[PDB]
């Protein structure tokens, strides 16, 4: 979700911006074959 819609629809920036809006996270990217927005 959050832009991570598989290896043909992998919007890392959308995920990153989603993750950065959550207190305590620095960023994010698509993981698990493009299907998971992973925040860090």
N, C-alpha and C. Protein backbone atom coordinates (compact mmCIF):
# COMPACT_ATOMS: atom_id res chain seq x y z
N UNK A 1 0.85 -1.26 0.00
CA UNK A 1 0.00 0.00 0.00
C UNK A 1 0.86 1.26 0.00
N UNK A 2 0.25 2.46 0.08
CA UNK A 2 1.00 3.72 0.23
C UNK A 2 1.98 3.87 -0.93
N UNK A 3 1.54 3.44 -2.10
CA UNK A 3 2.34 3.52 -3.32
C UNK A 3 3.04 2.24 -3.68
N UNK A 4 3.10 1.28 -2.75
CA UNK A 4 3.84 0.06 -2.99
C UNK A 4 2.81 -0.98 -3.47
N UNK A 5 2.70 -1.09 -4.78
CA UNK A 5 1.66 -1.93 -5.46
C UNK A 5 2.30 -2.95 -6.46
N UNK A 6 3.45 -3.38 -6.04
CA UNK A 6 4.06 -4.50 -6.70
C UNK A 6 5.15 -4.00 -7.59
N UNK A 7 5.82 -4.98 -8.24
CA UNK A 7 6.99 -4.61 -8.93
C UNK A 7 6.71 -3.76 -10.17
N UNK A 8 5.44 -3.65 -10.63
CA UNK A 8 5.07 -2.77 -11.77
C UNK A 8 4.34 -1.49 -11.37
N UNK A 9 4.23 -1.24 -10.07
CA UNK A 9 3.57 -0.05 -9.58
C UNK A 9 4.18 0.23 -8.18
N UNK A 10 5.49 0.50 -8.18
CA UNK A 10 6.29 0.63 -6.95
C UNK A 10 6.71 2.13 -6.74
N UNK A 11 5.85 2.91 -6.09
CA UNK A 11 6.04 4.35 -5.92
C UNK A 11 6.71 4.59 -4.57
N UNK A 12 8.00 4.38 -4.55
CA UNK A 12 8.81 4.54 -3.34
C UNK A 12 8.67 5.91 -2.70
N UNK A 13 8.53 6.95 -3.53
CA UNK A 13 8.44 8.29 -2.96
C UNK A 13 7.16 8.50 -2.19
N UNK A 14 6.06 7.95 -2.67
CA UNK A 14 4.80 8.03 -1.96
C UNK A 14 4.95 7.35 -0.63
N UNK A 15 5.57 6.18 -0.63
CA UNK A 15 5.77 5.50 0.64
C UNK A 15 6.67 6.28 1.58
N UNK A 16 7.74 6.80 1.05
CA UNK A 16 8.66 7.61 1.85
C UNK A 16 7.94 8.79 2.52
N UNK A 17 7.15 9.50 1.73
CA UNK A 17 6.45 10.67 2.26
C UNK A 17 5.41 10.27 3.26
N UNK A 18 4.74 9.16 3.05
CA UNK A 18 3.79 8.63 4.05
C UNK A 18 4.56 8.36 5.38
N UNK A 19 5.67 7.63 5.29
CA UNK A 19 6.43 7.24 6.47
C UNK A 19 6.96 8.45 7.23
N UNK A 20 7.45 9.46 6.52
CA UNK A 20 8.00 10.65 7.14
C UNK A 20 6.95 11.49 7.92
N UNK A 21 5.66 11.25 7.57
CA UNK A 21 4.58 11.96 8.27
C UNK A 21 4.25 11.34 9.65
N UNK A 22 4.85 10.14 9.93
CA UNK A 22 4.61 9.46 11.19
C UNK A 22 5.73 9.76 12.16
N UNK A 23 5.34 10.34 13.30
CA UNK A 23 6.27 10.67 14.35
C UNK A 23 7.20 9.50 14.66
N UNK A 24 8.49 9.76 14.57
CA UNK A 24 9.52 8.77 14.93
C UNK A 24 10.15 8.06 13.75
N UNK A 25 9.56 8.20 12.56
CA UNK A 25 10.13 7.53 11.37
C UNK A 25 10.86 8.55 10.58
N UNK A 26 11.93 8.12 9.92
CA UNK A 26 12.82 8.95 9.12
C UNK A 26 12.51 8.89 7.61
N UNK A 27 11.86 7.78 7.16
CA UNK A 27 11.69 7.54 5.71
C UNK A 27 11.02 6.25 5.52
N UNK A 28 10.93 5.89 4.27
CA UNK A 28 10.39 4.58 3.91
C UNK A 28 10.63 4.25 2.47
N UNK A 29 10.39 2.99 2.14
CA UNK A 29 10.54 2.54 0.75
C UNK A 29 9.73 1.28 0.56
N UNK A 30 9.51 0.92 -0.71
CA UNK A 30 8.79 -0.33 -0.99
C UNK A 30 9.67 -1.54 -0.86
N UNK A 31 9.16 -2.52 -0.15
CA UNK A 31 9.88 -3.77 0.15
C UNK A 31 8.99 -4.92 -0.22
N UNK A 32 9.50 -6.13 -0.03
CA UNK A 32 8.72 -7.36 -0.25
C UNK A 32 8.20 -7.40 -1.68
N UNK A 33 9.09 -7.20 -2.63
CA UNK A 33 8.72 -7.38 -4.03
C UNK A 33 7.90 -6.22 -4.53
N UNK A 34 7.96 -5.07 -3.85
CA UNK A 34 7.25 -3.88 -4.22
C UNK A 34 5.90 -3.74 -3.58
N UNK A 35 5.49 -4.70 -2.74
CA UNK A 35 4.12 -4.72 -2.22
C UNK A 35 3.95 -4.12 -0.84
N UNK A 36 5.05 -3.84 -0.13
CA UNK A 36 4.96 -3.39 1.28
C UNK A 36 5.64 -2.07 1.43
N UNK A 37 4.95 -1.09 2.00
CA UNK A 37 5.65 0.15 2.39
C UNK A 37 6.32 -0.07 3.73
N UNK A 38 7.65 -0.02 3.73
CA UNK A 38 8.46 -0.26 4.89
C UNK A 38 9.01 1.09 5.41
N UNK A 39 8.58 1.50 6.60
CA UNK A 39 9.10 2.71 7.22
C UNK A 39 10.30 2.39 8.06
N UNK A 40 11.19 3.33 8.21
CA UNK A 40 12.32 3.16 9.10
C UNK A 40 12.58 4.43 9.94
